[PDB]
Amino acid sequence: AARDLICAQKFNGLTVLPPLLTDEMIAQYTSALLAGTITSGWTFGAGAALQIPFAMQMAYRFNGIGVTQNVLYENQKLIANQFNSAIGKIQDSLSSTAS
Amino acid sequence: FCGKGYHLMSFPQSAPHGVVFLHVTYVPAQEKNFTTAPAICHDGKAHFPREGVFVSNGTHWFVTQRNFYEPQIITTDNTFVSGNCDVVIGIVNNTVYDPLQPELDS
Ligand SMILES: *[C@@H]1O[C@H](CO)[C@@H](O)[C@H](O)[C@H]1NC(C)=O
Ligand SMILES: *[C@@H]1O[C@H](CO)[C@@H](O)[C@H](O)[C@H]1NC(C)=O
């Protein structure tokens, strides 16, 4: 007890209540959101999840920002590689940097 | 932000110390599954939809708007050309109808 502040807090009437949702449940929610996004784009946010091939969904998104979809299709490998490298950079930064 | 679904419109109603919004939204209802392709190969050229998406019921290819099934014959007014057929992954062979060709023929 002497080397722990939590025990003193508890002994003086100060306690911590657990969250209703566990970490596992929150991870399930995020995985459901991710599965919906990568399988159905934005359709599952408006109704039933409507499956669409992911490259075609990216063509839709390219249209959304004012770029013709042949730009996506003709550069598909380059765009996938750029995304993969960017994700890898995110992972490396989270692994290395400490704060 | 304005209800669940694609927002159409909203109507306000006063309430004691507050407001009530009646959000009217459009919700897609009865989905059917189709075969799809990103582009159509015709005469060695790649065709992409101008506004919709290429779909197949099993034997025939059409272009439809994305949020409501309305199949139409794939034509040069429906699509635009970009490059040849060698680059697009998943391109599908089909004919693209030219409206001017029958008129020139007749
Ligand atoms: C729709 O899905 C069913 C179930 O797998 C399949 O048998 C059928 O061929 C699909 N239809 C089209 C047009 O892809
Ligand atoms: C696809 O549609 C065409 C024209 O509507 C029709 O002739 C053909 O039989 C259909 N094929 C199916 C439903 O497998």
Ligand SMILES: *[C@@H]1O[C@H](CO)[C@@H](O)[C@H](O)[C@H]1NC(C)=O
């Ligand atoms: C599409 O047509 C081209 C040229 O006629 C041919 O080389 C290619 O093999 C065809 N693709 C399929 C899937 O039949």
